[PDB]
């Protein structure tokens, strides 16, 4: 109905709780392997944030996998920064990590992150 | 780090995608039964929104259940309205449903919804 009222903070409060479940390893259902590093997560949050994970977990065979191995060229710190962004809306973008973050966001298909990386790089040229 | 940048719309965009997955029945992992009605959902979203579901799905036996039956006194339309609110931040509160919505939100332990129901009822006294 068009007569709904809306609770402004609801979406951010849901995301905070999903991150608390991730921190406590509650109902995590996939491990993402990035070279020597493993990251536990919820498939639904990954799909909701990434075009690559949306494609992976909607595939009729890959939806059932409990381990996903990323391309060996992917930087684990870049992936960690993006996984934290998925669960918090906050991106720890620094001069020392921006190239790895942008490459990882292009691979994961995270357009808004790629856009802000491109802008920060362009400002330093 | 405290040097993070933040994408304002991220949390609302994640919630929109979680609702799209719910609509398409993608990676839903529980059925909530409310008398004669069944509602498919994601356990993590339910836990993130409700004190009752947070308690249920953190229990070492109930976390593994694929069907949860609610108390027979719970109104299915009231539950449906609250499940839609969990996934959208929008509450379809009407004169004809407010009593059932408030009773259901008290049972589910959804404090902000109970508070707005109490205010709307108090305004009509």
């Amino acid at each position: 109905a068009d007569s709904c009222i809306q609770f402004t903070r609801h979406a951010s409060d849901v995301l905070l709780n999903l991150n608390r479940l991730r921190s406590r390893d509650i109902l995590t259902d996939v491990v993402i392997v990035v070279s020597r590093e493993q990251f536990r997560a919820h498939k639904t949050v990954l799909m909701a944030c990434s075009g690559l994970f949306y494609s992976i977990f909607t595939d009729q065979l890959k939806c059932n996998l409990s381990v996903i191995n990323l391309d060996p060229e992917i930087n684990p710190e870049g992936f960690c920064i993006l996984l934290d962004f998925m669960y918090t809306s906050r991106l720890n973008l620094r001069e020392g990590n921006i190239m790895a973050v942008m490459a990882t966001a292009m691979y994961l298909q995270m357009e808004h992150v790629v856009d802000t990386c491109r802008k920060f790089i362009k400002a330093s040229e | 780090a405290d040097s993070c940048i933040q994408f304002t719309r991220h949390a609302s965009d994640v919630l929109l995608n979680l609702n799209r997955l719910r609509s398409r029945d993608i990676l839903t992992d529980v059925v909530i039964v409310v008398s004669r009605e069944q509602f498919r959902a994601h356990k993590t979203v339910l836990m993130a929104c409700s004190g009752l579901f947070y308690s249920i799905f953190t229990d070492q036996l109930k976390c593994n259940l694929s069907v949860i039956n609610l108390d027979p006194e719970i109104n299915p339309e009231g539950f449906c309205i609250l499940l839609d609110f969990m996934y959208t931040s929008r509450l379809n509160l009407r004169e004809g449903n407010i009593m059932a919505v408030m009773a259901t939100a008290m049972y589910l332990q959804m404090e902000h919804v109970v508070d707005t129901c109490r205010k709307f009822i108090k305004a009509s006294e």
């Binding site: 709904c4 009222i5 809306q6 609770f7 402004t8 | 929008r90 509450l91 902000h112």
Partner: peptide, 5 residues
């Protein structure tokens, strides 16, 4: 919080 969206 609550608002008219």
């Amino acid at each position: 919080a609550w608002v008219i969206p």
